[PDB]
């Protein structure tokens with residue numbers, strides 16, 4: 001599987017100029033989606049924050065003062081409508097939702113229990129959510145006129161951090177792969193062959209098309225199917241619209257509102 005270098009070739013998006021740098025990167029990003037099936041940007045300083053976050057998660061995974069399993073999903077208060085946040089014991093991982101970051105009450109306790117990790121996770125969540133919303137505006141701009149805004153929801157979006165890790169794609173609208181600790185993540189190209197982005201220990205983030213966006217675009221953009229081939233930590237933002245909101249679909253240039261909700265799509 002060929003390596004794909006991205007450091008130094010992907011568009012640069014600076015942490016304190018995100019909106020302006022993403023506007024400049026728009027054409028490069030569109031050409032990635034058209035030419036590869038996934039997108040990429042280099043964000044100077046992101047790797048520093050993500051590695052710190054991941055290493056603090058690894059330490060928390062071994063801790064007992066309070067243990068992360070004290071915040072396993074089945075003992076964390078969950079939203080009446082939405083996905084499941086909290087810790088998933090053993091390959092062991094945590095979902096930090098936007099709702100959890102705002103304590104929606106007690107859901108925030110895992111971040112109060114591990115505040116060094118939790119502060120980094122909130123920081124990375126916020127950067128990732130700003131970036132991914134601008135990626136969605138790029139993709140929207142490629143879609144026919146009258147395409148609605150993606151309407152990604154802060155509270156329904158979640159940052160997953162994994163501790164010990166076949167081909168698949170995300171169910172949601174978009175994903176943002178942050179630089180993992182090790183190489184091994186691979187993506188399939190439009191020609192059906194696989195590539196391995198060089199991203200471990202870099203400032204490069206990848207943006208994945210999820211299956212909700214494949215549906216909303218009526219097949220125009222296939223999911224950014226990927227797999228992990230190892231020879232070990234990783235984090236990714238999964239961006240969702242509001243679960244109770246009505247699906248829509250651009251069919252042959254016409255906007256269609258459906259009865260089914262985005263929550264129905266997940267089920």
Ligand SMILES: [Cl-]
Pocket residue numbers: 168169170171175
């Ligand atoms: Cl995924």
Ligand SMILES: [Fe+3]
Pocket residue numbers: 168169170226
């Ligand atoms: Fe994935």
